[PDB]
Each structure stands twice: as C-alpha cells, then as structure tokens.
C-alpha cells in the first residue's frame, strides 16, 4: 500500500492533460534518404564491374 500511494502522488505531480506534440520524424527521413543513395551507388558499381569483366576476357 505504501508503494502504490507514493506512485499516485508522483502521478499527481506529473499529469497535465495535453498530448505532448514532440516527435522524431525528420532525422529518420534523412537517414533513409542516405541509405537509398548508397544503394544507387552499389547498383551502378556492379554494372560497371560487369562491363569491364566482359572486356578483359577475349
């Protein structure tokens, strides 16, 4: 009973009844952009690799 009563008092000092409109969306978009930029790079590199591979072989 001691612990629950203390917890209720703590909630009575931290409650305000508003939705708290912070968030973390922008940095997550930026990081996703960077990952797909790296993927583009990896695709083009593989293509160059295969054309050089086929020229070296005759």
């Amino acid at each position: 009973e001691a612990e629950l009563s203390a917890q209720i008092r703590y909630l009575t000092q931290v409650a305000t009844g508003q939705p708290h409109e912070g968030s973390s969306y922008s940095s997550r978009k930026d990081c996703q952009m960077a990952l797909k930029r790296v993927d583009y790079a990896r695709l083009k590199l593989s293509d160059v690799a295969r054309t050089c591979e086929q020229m070296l072989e005759n």
């Binding site: 790296v38 790079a41 990896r42 590199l45 593989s46 020229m55 070296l56």
Partner: peptide, 27 residues
C-alpha cells in the same frame, strides 16, 4: 605494347572496383 598497357590498366580498375564494392556492401 599499348595493348598490354590497356589490359593492365582495365584490370587494375576492376580490382579496385571489386574492393570498393565489397567495402560499400559491408554496411
């Protein structure tokens, strides 16, 4: 002689290309 020069240089580009391909794939 210039034929061998071209072959060696394109081989060097391919080796480094494979190296950086694996470096970027390790992410």
């Amino acid at each position: 002689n210039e034929l061998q020069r071209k072959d060696a240089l394109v081989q060097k580009h391919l080796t480094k290309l494979r190296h950086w391909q694996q470096v970027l794939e390790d992410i």
